[PDB]
Design a protein around this ligand. Structure first.
Ligand SMILES: Nc1ncnc2c1ncn2[C@@H]1O[C@H](COP(=O)(O)OP(=O)(O)OP(=O)(O)O)[C@@H](O)[C@H]1O
Ligand SMILES: CC(C)C[C@H](N)CO
Ligand SMILES: [Mg+2]
Ligand SMILES: [Mg+2]
Ligand SMILES: [Zn+2]
Length: 867
């Protein structure tokens, strides 16, 4: 063994030994329980940075832990290679998208291999390859023919800077997820996935996810936004049928989410386009004035109609009103009004002097007609009043009673709605999966036959920056219709990158399977992802899509699971300084801190910052998430070349609990390296003074107290590291525990024959406990300590015999008559026995109150309080 810790020697040798052994290349092996641990794969949008090191070291710790415990561990890596992140990076570096993406992939792969992650590289997947994206084109055609995928014109989200439509989930704070530019509305046709068909299932299955952070589930519940409401029909009065447009002559249909207040409806409002407004204007020019004027912030306008509808629950005749807030296209284009318990209704009926009937009571609070209070709208603690046989019911009981009422009369029925909208996936972008549709002017939009898939995206295209490039390539889009054989045009829009991100975890199970998305036998074997690791930014963007896709694929018979990810760890962000300049196109040019010289004030505040290459200023933007797209990352390859990969991994797990934000610091890097030197030095000086021996094991009677205490600390540590990896998933406290063990070891004289045997046991355990975190140095130290393979020695076990404290039971006497019994320490002095003997209730009671006249102490045998 060399004295000095030289990572450039040992890290390549250790990786080659692991590679030759093929311990990460796994099969569908029924003789070992499976463990599928997966980190969210990266966009090829730049170089990986230390934030990725944190993300992928967490996965590697968990994978290597499970490997040492006998699991068949699959930890795959691949490349989220299609769509905006890779294509925008290509254009910003003046590179064609294909050539940029495959070169960036090769660099990212080198970075990850340098870090020694136990990755099955034979399952590597690149989503921009036809052997991958042909299968999402297949699913698309399958879903398109069932109507689960459809094309429709509509009002869509338009990004003027990325020059593409975007899905609702890609609109962040009204800005595009990659551009940060303000989104505009446009009428553009799009292909949609009918995710609202699965809205109930996506919502309710959240209850199954017991090992997901509650925050992710809360945000998906709010994004789905399920509303339980009631359709309610008010029959049109006999006096008000002038204009019989079918059922618009019989009744007026509304929707409401407060049917518990239906007894409180004092009028009804209707849209200017609704037939009620049409009939009540045939002889009303001041009605068509409102109709033309109208045809959440605008203050409400309204006009009475003179037509009347009937409350089905009590028979009250309510006047219909033309309203500015009712929009045809949202449901039946008509609403009811309960001014006493809805703020929007209270203000309208205050402006137009319309009655307000109190119908909900909330405990001690008194009602005030001309003065709204927030308790008027409590949907939790209220109780119904003035409501016939509904009196006394709370919201949830009254909801069901109203439904029973309305249904017996045929005048209503419950109806669910959701804020969730269907998923718009087509993009006016080149670098993405082609949409397998052909437009024939006779047959319509026809899917491409399965036998003709994939539609191969041409790869030698350089986007000019002016709209969809495929729209400009008739060598691509001119074709013949697959049903009639005549002239036709391919769809030139492509699929958003979140199509590929929505099923890659299944493709990893059989990445070379050429007859489907995923082979049946591997899908049955791997089941779901046991452990998933990625940032909280994916809570709605991707994690919702992935669950939807899983359910789509299950219903098509491709997989047999309801959810893709059983456990989810959302690691905290590595954050660091950020800088940029505004460019001529109004967009920021981000600049790496390594290229910035700063100027400070007397207190230490950075006041100025300049680019070192041109001496000209840059903007100090503040600490921020380490981001490829913000050019603020610290490249792991830089740390590896200076300090070793182990130092890089160790710093990221030690600096903070995994969910806590981690500020970058050079001091932390140095502290991690000194610990690795200490571990190297500790093993080196153990072996320099006698060489390895057989590790202590078995019964420890006859060991000195000092060596017993150390074995107690050793097996306590094993117990704690085990709990930290397997139950708590807290890696910093695992490292801290091992440091404490090494601290006690440094203070224990292990020079003796039994001493060296306990030293070997301590060091054999420590390097295994740390192997998931810093596997390179631990593989090298273990092979200097022990001739066997490390991954075959397995996870260290807890010797429970080493945990029993070393005690002793002394008998106490009074007058000589045995009067009690106490336990004390084995190393206890004569006085502590004397103090403990008097603390015995027995001796206290037998001695009465007399002071002791003497106390005879038999060494480790008896105490005689002569009272
Ligand atoms: N600063 C960071 N700290 C921890 N994890 C991070 C950090 N940045 C990214 N990740 C994680 O790395 C994984 C890969 O993400 P991604 O490829 O988007 O990297 P990125 O740095 O965010 O790039 P981009 O800026 O282009 O979005 C994700 O799971 C993401 O949460
Ligand atoms: C699973 C994927 C959506 C992850 C992205 N490539 C990184 O944010
Ligand atoms: Mg369960
Ligand atoms: Mg990102
Ligand atoms: Zn045709």
């Amino acid at each position: 063994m060399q004295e000095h810790y030289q990572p450039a020697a040992i890290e390549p040798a250790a990786q080659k030994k692991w590679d030759d052994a093929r311990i990460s290349n796994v099969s569908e092996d029924a003789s070992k329980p499976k463990y599928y641990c997966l980190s969210m794969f990266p966009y090829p949008s730049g170089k990986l940075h230390m934030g990725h090191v944190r993300n992928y070291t967490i996965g590697d710790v968990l994978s290597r832990f499970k490997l040492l415990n006998g699991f068949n561990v699959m930890q795959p890596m691949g490349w989220d290679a299609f769509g905006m992140p890779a294509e925008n990076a290509a254009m910003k570096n003046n590179v064609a998208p294909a050539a940029w993406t495959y070169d960036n992939i090769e660099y990212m792969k080198t970075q990850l291999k340098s870090l020694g992650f136990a990755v099955d590289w034979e399952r590597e997947v690149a989503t921009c390859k036809p052997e991958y994206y042909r299968w999402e084109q297949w699913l698309f055609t399958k879903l398109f023919e069932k109507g689960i995928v459809y094309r429709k014109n509509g009002t869509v989200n338009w990004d003027p800077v990325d020059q593409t439509v975007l899905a609702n989930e890609q609109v962040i704070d009204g800005r595009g997820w990659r551009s940060g530019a303000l989104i505009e509305k446009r009428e553009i046709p799009m292909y949609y996935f009918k995710i609202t068909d699965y809205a109930e299932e996506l919502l309710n299955d959240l209850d199954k996810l017991e090992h997901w952070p509650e925050q992710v589930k809360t945000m998906q519940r709010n994004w789905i936004g399920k509303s339980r409401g009631m359709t309610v029909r008010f029959a049109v009065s006999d006096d008000s049928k002038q204009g019989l447009e079918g059922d618009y002559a019989k009744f007026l249909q509304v929707y409401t989410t407060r049917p518990d207040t239906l007894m409180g409806a004092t009028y009804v409002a209707v849209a200017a386009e609704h037939p009620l407004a049409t009939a009540a204007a045939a002889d009303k020019p001041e009605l068509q004035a409102f109709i033309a004027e109208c045809k959440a912030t605008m203050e409400k306008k309204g006009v009475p109609t003179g037509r009347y509808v009937v409350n089905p629950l009590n028979g009250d005749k309510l006047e219909v009103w033309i309203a500015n807030y009712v929009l045809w296209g949202y449901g039946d284009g008509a609403v009811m009004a309960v001014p006493a318990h809805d703020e929007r209704d209270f203000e309208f009926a205050a402006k137009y002097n319309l009655p307000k009937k109190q119908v909900i009571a909330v405990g001690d609070n008194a009602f005030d007609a001309n003065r709204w209070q927030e308790w008027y709208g409590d949907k939790e603690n209220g109780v119904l009043v003035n409501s016939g046989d509904l009196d006394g019911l709370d919201f949830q009981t009254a909801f069901d009673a109203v439904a029973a009422k309305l249904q017996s009369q045929g005048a209503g029925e419950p109806k669910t709605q959701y804020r969730l909208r269907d998923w718009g996936i087509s993009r006016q972008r080149y670098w993405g999966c082609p949409i397998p549709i052909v437009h024939c002017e006779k047959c319509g939009n026809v899917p491409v036959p399965a036998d003709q898939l994939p539609v191969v995206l041409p790869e030698n295209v350089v986007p000019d920056g002016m709209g969809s490039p495929l729209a400009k390539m008739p060598e691509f889009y001119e074709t013949s219709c697959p049903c009639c054989g005549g002239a036709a045009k391919r769809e030139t829009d492509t699929m958003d990158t979140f199509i590929e991100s929505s099923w890659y975890f299944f493709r990893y199970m059989s990445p070379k399977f050429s007859d489907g998305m995923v082979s049946a036998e591997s899908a049955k074997y791997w089941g779901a992802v046991d452990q998933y690791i990625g940032g909280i930014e994916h809570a709605i963007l991707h994690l919702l899509y992935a669950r939807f896709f899983t359910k789509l694929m299950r219903d098509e018979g491709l997989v047999n699971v309801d959810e893709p990810f059983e456990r989810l760890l959302t690691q905290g962000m590595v954050v660091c300084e950020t800088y940029y300049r505004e460019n001529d196109k109004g967009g920021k040019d981000w600049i790496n801190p390594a290229d910035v010289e700063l100027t400070f004030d007397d207190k230490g505040r950075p006041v100025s910052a300049v680019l070192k290459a041109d001496g000209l200023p840059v903007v100090i933007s503040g600490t921020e998430k380490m981001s490829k797209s913000k050019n603020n990352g610290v490249d792991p390859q830089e740390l590896i070349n200076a300090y070793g990969a182990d130092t890089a991994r160790l710093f990221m797990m030690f600096a903070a609990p995994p969910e806590q934000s981690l500020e970058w610091s050079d001091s932390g890097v140095e502290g991690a390296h000194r610990f690795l030197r200490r571990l190297w030095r500790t093993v080196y000086e153990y072996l320099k003074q006698g060489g390895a021996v057989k590790a202590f094991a078995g019964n420890q009677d006859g060991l000195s107290k000092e060596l017993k205490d150390l074995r107690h600390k050793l097996h306590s540590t094993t117990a704690k590291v085990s709990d930290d990896y397997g139950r708590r998933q807290q890696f910093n406290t695992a490292i801290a525990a091992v440091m404490e063990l090494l601290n006690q070891y440094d203070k224990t004289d292990t020079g003796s024959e039994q001493g060296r045997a306990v030293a070997q046991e301590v060091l054999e355990a420590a390097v295994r406990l740390l192997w998931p975190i810093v596997p390179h140095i631990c593989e090298t130290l273990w092979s200097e300590l022990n001739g066997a393979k490390l991954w075959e020695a397995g996870w260290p076990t807890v010797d429970e015999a080493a945990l029993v404290k070393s005690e002793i039971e002394v008998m106490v006497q009074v007058n000589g008559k045995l009067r009690g019994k106490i336990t004390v320490a084995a190393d206890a002095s004569k006085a502590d026995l004397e103090a403990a003997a008097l603390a015995n209730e027995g001796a206290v009671k037998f001695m009465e109150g007399k002071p002791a006249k003497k106390i005879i102490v038999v060494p480790g045998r008896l105490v005689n309080i002569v009272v």
